């Protein structure tokens, strides 16, 4: 469909209220005046494409997901993956926890063991102090929930106080930074040490979210053995990303083609999600692929699963200022942060699935066979003028290999 | 002329000050003054299912001094204080002589993964013995790049034991001003048949790698203590605390993630402005951060007590581009490159690397002060 036909179709689907639909048809943008409130030294605005990924089925609810990407084929891939996985029942997703982590680092602590025990014994008192430093969140039902103290040996040694905070629908960088700043004096007195910093942590292991899918082999190919072969290769591709960091970077980049597209569309901080997830990818001592694809040979199903820190937000940042971000949240039915996180996780896994399927699939047939035959021609030692006759003979056979290329090369020259 | 007063100037006055700097041609200045955006029609050719466009702020970071050359850096970010921090850091570091940056190598890596190789050692030697023949085969698969002076330069083979074992053929390719995903993927498709024949194995995939360790770029600065504070000794204390914060990021992954995020507030901002793939740079760099077995901070700040200097350094994979993709289709991306003086990709990599370190400096300074 054309651009305009896409708008008519979206209008007929009634996914947007009449006002939002009109806004989108006028392609309403954040104004320079509002942009001037989001950033500094603003001299204009910058536009990217805004696309829709239909039929994203998460926990039995179907969504049309907005994407902002400049990379060709990314949206098409996500739509393709979503369609297949919808046939296979959609995604199942869950939030394990949703809390943000902040830390105060202390140094020059003469007696770290005692300091650790003193601080741990004042846990409730210190959590009450953080809550009083930012009193709005407790009134609204959130707040600082836990505290842990760790010694980190090295050059020099650090004593690190971590707080775990329920920030509800917000990202909470300012909340944690305010709470941590209030804790510094008492943490110094309790430890008799020096406060180095108090800052939120983007290694958001209190906000893990998991999505999965289960794809019968028949959705991968009609030829019974073929679908199994595609599934087997996708699992092998997932295993390869576990073995080679050079593959892992590309595997995970492919996930974030999708994730970053919907983060931008929803006003979320993708540098934060990227950092937390790529750090999560090396928690076992090696940088590895973030998702796992495995075979269910008994059920003949390909199983995909991906766990990430996904501390996204539905309030704050530009979510209220950029009008198209507001439209994106409306388009999704105004999900909570937890629901949004589960949608984003599914999208990331969908994006990954389309990449792996394309990576492992072979045989352009008509054109691929001439590519194959020319490579074998050259390896056989064909010179420049011999290549075209060679390829022509090869591709005209039911099958061929290097030995065929070499034998025909000898016929050519003899 | 001076950039003083630029942040407090109105939008209209900022544009006038930019005009006074004579950084842009009449057409580009006009384009910016009308805030010209990529149209829906052009967007419709860059992506699929397009139903509109999405706008973000566009800002300038002036006085970025890299290898004796001064730049006005464009930023696209939605996070308050990011542009201000980068501008603050850049001015201080310009006072301190600016950045020194160098490109160690500029090549892309692609890989073919082979499995079911009965004799990996033999396959490894057979493949190595046809190296020159394989490199020429790859170059003929994408002959336009060779006409421009690039192409496949090297090829090596590794056994990666595991479940199962893989035999991996890596190619190292000079992609010139492009990122070269299509170039490498095309060469790799051509290599699959012959690599399978040589190895007597099965090709699993042939794809470029975003772990771009053949494209490392290093940037550094040396900031006298007196540029960190007017009160003198306070400057040394700030230097000491920034070095400590850098060390904390070597010790705790919970800190390293935030440290590295803070770097990419800046890097991704200029990547978007120049039409480059920020997922690719993010992935390779975060992968680089755990090369020593632990996820660690990507930059190092150290005290030079003897010279009374705070020293900053950062090495990253930075395979950025000046040709291809949306580069040139989005009118503001074309404008961003003109704004930088149309740097080569190598030059741009050095500017971006410097920007990331500048951003990092402002984050750490604000954190410990
Ligand atoms: N994991 C990944 O990163 C992957 C990314 N991509 C996406 O593809 C794009 C990057 O791939 P890429 O191959 O670089 O882009 P292109 O496919 O568009 O190829 C680059 C084009 O620029 C031309 N050109 C002009 N000058 C030069 C020069 N000095 N050096 C090289 N080329 C020049 C080339 O030659 P000419 O016009 O004369 O033929 C060619 O047409 C990005 O959008 C990326 O996101 C795609 C697949 C995988």
Distance in Å, alpha carbon of B6 to nearest chain A alpha carbon: 7
Cβ A53 vs Cβ A347: under 8 Å: yes
Residue A85, H or E segment: helix A74-87
Distance CA(B35)–CA(B31), nearest Å, equals: 6
* Residue B285 C-beta-side C-alpha neighbours within 13 Å: 32
DSSP letter, residue B227: G
User: What residues does A42 pair with on adjacent strands?
Assistant: B59
Distance CA B57, CA A206 (A): 31
B327 CA distance to ligand 1 middle (Å): 10
Residue A310 contacts residue A208 (beta carbons within 8 Å): yes
Question: Could you tell me the strand order of the sheet in which B100-103 lies?
Answer: B100-103, B216-224, B309-317, B299-304
CA-to-CA dists, residue A169 to A131, A134, A340, B52, angstroms: 17, 16, 10, 27
Maximum C-alpha span of chain A: 93
Q: Which of B58, B109, B209 sits opposite A43 (nearest CB)?
A: B58
C-beta of residue A349 within 8 angstroms of C-beta of residue A251: no
Q: What is the DSSP letter of A383?
A: -
Judged by DSSP in three states, A39 sits in: coil
SS3 A149: strand
Task: Measure Cα distances from A278 to A207, A248, A290, A310, B144 in Å.
Answer: 15, 10, 8, 12, 35
In degrees and rounded to multiples of 5, residue A64 shows phi and psi of -105, 115
Method of determination is: X-ray
Are the C-beta atoms of residues B59 and B77 closer than 8 Å to each other? yes
A50:B32 CB<8 A: no
CA distance B313 to B220: 4
How far is the C-alpha of A375 from the C-alpha of A363, rounded, in Å? 15
Q: How many whole angstroms from B296 Cα to the centroid of ligand 1?
A: 32
Residue A385, Cβ neighbours under 10 Å: how many? Answer: 8
Domains of chain A: 1-98+202-362 (3.90.770.10), 99-201 (3.30.70.420), 363-414 (1.10.8.660)
Question: Whose CA is closest to atom 17 on ligand 1?
Answer: B182
Do residue A246 and residue B211 have CB atoms under 8 angstroms apart? yes
From chain B, pick out residues whose CB is under 8 angstroms from the CB of A278: 282-283, 286-287, 289
What distance in Å separates residue A125's CA from the closest CA in chain B?
24
Resolution in A: 2.0
Check residue A384 and report its DSSP letter: G
Q: Where are the beta strands (DSSP E) in chain B?
A: 50-66, 69-75, 100-103, 108-115, 151-160, 166-174, 202-209, 216-224, 299-304, 309-317
- Helix ranges restricted to H, B200-252: 233-251
Show the CA angle centred on residue A260, arms to residues A257 and A266, nearest 5°. Answer: 140
Q: For chain B, how big is the Rg over CA atoms in Å?
A: 23
Phi, psi (deg, nearest 5) at residue B354 = -60, -45
B126 and chain A in contact, CB less than 8 A: no
End-to-end Cα, chain A, rounded Å: 56
| Pairwise CB contact (< 8 Å): A52 & B49 | yes
Q: Which residues contact A273 (CB under 8 A, 6 or more apart)?
A: A256, A259, A260, A263, A308, A309, A310, A311, A312
Alpha carbons A176 and A130: distance in angstroms, whole number: 9
- Beta strands B151-160 and B309-317 are unpaired
Alpha-carbon separation of residue A45 from A339, B57, B348 (angstroms): 30, 5, 22
How many CA atoms lie within 13 Å of A124's alpha carbon, on the beta-carbon side?
0
Scan residues 309-328 of B and list those with Cβ closer than 8 Å to A. Answer: 325-326
Provide the 10 A C-beta neighbour count for residue B234. 13
Contact A105, A197 (CB under 8 A): yes
Cβ neighbours of residue B266 closer than 8 Å, sequence gap 6 or more = B75, B82, B86, B355, B356, B358, B359, B360
Q: At what angle do helices B131-141 and B181-199 cross, to 10 degrees?
A: 140
Measure Cα distances from A56 to A52, A59, A150, A343, B266 in Å. 10, 10, 42, 8, 32
Phi, psi of A199 (to 5 degrees): -155, 150
Contacts of range A121-128, beta carbons closer than 8 Å, 24 or more positions apart: A122/A186, A122/A190, A123/A147, A126/A183, A126/A186, A126/A187, A127/A163
Q: Is the peptide bond before A385 cis (omega within 30 degrees of 0)?
A: no
The phi and psi torsions of A171 (rounded to 5 degrees) equal -75, -40
Chain B residue numbers with beta carbons less than 8 Å from the beta carbon of A359 are: 205, 207
d(CA B320, CA B350): 10
SS3 A87: helix
Q: Report how far ligand 1's centroid is from the alpha carbon of B323 (Å).
A: 7
Kindly report the length of chain B: 369
B38 touches chain A (CB under 8 A): yes
A35 in B contact zone (CB under 8 Å): yes
Q: Are A355 and A77 in contact (CB under 8 A)?
A: yes
Kind of pairing between the strands at A42-58 and B50-66: antiparallel
Count of CB atoms situated within 10 Å of the CB of A346:
30
| C-beta separation of A377 from A387 below 8 A | yes
Residues within 8 A of A (CB atoms), B 333-352 only: none
Note whether B184 and B205 are within 8 A (CB). Answer: no
- Phi then psi for A166, rounded to 5 degrees? -85, 105
**A241 vs A212, B143, B253, CA distance in Å?**
18, 30, 22
Contact call for residues B303 and B243 (beta carbons, < 8 A): yes
**Would you say B364 and B244 are in contact if contact means Cβ atoms under 8 Å apart?**
no
Strand partners, B218: B102, B315
A317's enclosing H/E stretch is none
How many Cβ atoms are within 10 Å of B196's Cβ, its own excluded?
A: 20
Q: Do residue B247 and residue A154 have CB atoms under 8 angstroms apart?
A: yes
Sign of CA dihedral A218, A220, A225, A226: positive
DSSP state of B270: H
The neighbouring-strand residues paired with A308 are: A209
A324–B113 C-beta distance less than 8 A: no
- Cβ neighbours for B296, distance < 8 A, ≥ 6 positions apart: B249, B250, B253, B256, B289, B290
Q: Residue A55: which residues within 8 A CB-CB, separation 6 or more? A: A62, A64, A79, A82, A83, A86
CA pair distance B18, A39, nearest whole angstrom: 17
Q: By the CB < 8 Å criterion, does B53 face chain A?
A: yes
Half-sphere exposure of A372 (CA within 13 A, CB side): 22
Q: Name residue B154's beta-bridge partners.
A: B172
- Mutate which of A24, A40, A278 to disrupt the B interface (most B C-beta within 10 Å)? A40
Specify the ligand 1 atom closest to the Cα of A253: 1
Q: Contact, A194 vs A107, CB < 8 A? A: yes
Residues 6 or more apart whose Cβ sits within 8 Å of residue A393: A408
- Cβ contacts of A8 within 8 Å, gap of 6 or more: none
What Cα–Cα distance (Å) separates residue B45 from each residue in A3, A70, A74?
11, 10, 12
CB spacing of B11 vs A32 below 8 angstroms: yes
Q: Which residue of B has its CA nearest to A68?
A: B54
CA B192, CA B210: separation in Å to the nearest integer?
A: 20
- Residue A278 is nearest to which of B52, B168, B283, comparing CB atoms? B283
Q: Say which DSSP state A26 is in.
A: T
**Within 13 Å of residue A357, how many CA atoms lie on the same side as its CB?**
23
Q: How far is it, in rounded angstroms, from Cα A308 to Cα A287? A: 14
Asked if B268 has any chain A CB less than 8 Å from its own CB, the reply is yes
**B313 has which bridge partners?**
B220, B300
Contacts of A73 by beta carbon, 8 Å cutoff, 6+ apart: B48
Query: Which residues of A are catalytically annotated?
Result: 71, 253, 269, 368
A237 inside 8 A of chain B by CB: yes
| Residue B39 near residue B329, CB atoms below 8 Å | no
Give the number of the atom of ligand 1 that is nearest the alpha carbon of residue A72: 43
Q: What's the burial of B143, exposed, middle or buried (CB within 10 Å: 0-12/13-18/19+)? A: exposed
User: Hey, are the CB atoms on B211 and A51 less than 8 Å from each other?
Assistant: no
Determine contact: B330 vs chain A, CB below 8 A.
Answer: yes
CA B109 to centroid of ligand 1, rounded, Å: 14
* CB-based contact A29:A45 (threshold 8 Å): yes
């Amino acid at each position: 469909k054309s651009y305009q036909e896409r708008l008519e179709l979206l209008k007929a689907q009634a996914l947007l209220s009449p006002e939002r639909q009109a806004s989108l048809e006028k392609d309403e943008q954040m104004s320079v005046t509002v942009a001037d409130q989001l950033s500094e030294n603003v001299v204009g605005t910058f536009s990217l494409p805004y696309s829709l990924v239909p039929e994203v089925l998460v926990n039995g609810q179907e969504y049309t997901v907005p994407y902002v990407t400049e990379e060709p084929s990314v949206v098409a891939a996500a739509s393709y993956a979503s369609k297949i996985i919808k046939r296979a029942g959609g995604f199942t997703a869950q939030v394990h926890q949703r809390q943000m982590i902040g830390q105060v680092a202390l140094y020059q602590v003469a007696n770290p063991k005692l300091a650790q025990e003193k601080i741990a014994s004042k846990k409730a008192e210190l959590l009450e102090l953080a809550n009083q430093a930012y009193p709005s969140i407790v009134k609204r039902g959130g707040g600082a929930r836990d505290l842990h103290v760790e010694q980190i040996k090295g050059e020099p040694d650090f004593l690190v106080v971590y707080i775990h905070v329920d920030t509800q629908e917000a990202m909470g960088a300012n909340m944690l930074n305010t709470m941590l700043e209030a804790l510094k004096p008492v943490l110094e007195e309790l430890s008799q040490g020096q406060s180095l910093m108090g800052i939120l942590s983007n290694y958001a292991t209190d906000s893990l979210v998991t999505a999965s899918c289960r794809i019968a082999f028949r959705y991968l190919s009609r030829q019974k053995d073929q679908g199994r072969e595609i599934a087997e290769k996708i699992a092998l591709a997932s295993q390869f990303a576990q073995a080679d960091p050079y593959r892992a970077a590309t595997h995970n980049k492919g996930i974030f083609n999708g994730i970053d597209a919907i983060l931008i569309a929803t006003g979320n901080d993708w540098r934060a999600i990227e950092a937390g997830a790529h750090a999560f990818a090396s928690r076992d001592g090696r940088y590895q692929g973030l998702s796992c694809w495995t075979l269910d040979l008994e059920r003949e199903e390909l199983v995909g699963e991906m766990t990430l820190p996904m501390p996204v937000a539905t309030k704050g940042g530009s979510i209220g200022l950029n009008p198209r971000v507001a439209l994106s949240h409306d388009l999704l039915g105004n999900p909570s942060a937890r629901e949004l996180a589960q949608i984003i996780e599914s999208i990331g896994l969908a994006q990954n699935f389309a990449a792996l399927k394309a990576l492992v699939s072979t045989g352009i047939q008509q054109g691929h066979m001439k590519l194959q035959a020319k490579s074998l021609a050259l390896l056989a030692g064909a010179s420049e003028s011999e290549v075209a006759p060679l390829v022509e003979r090869l591709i005209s056979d039911k099958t061929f290999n290097l030995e065929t290329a070499q034998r025909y090369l000898e016929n050519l020259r003899s």
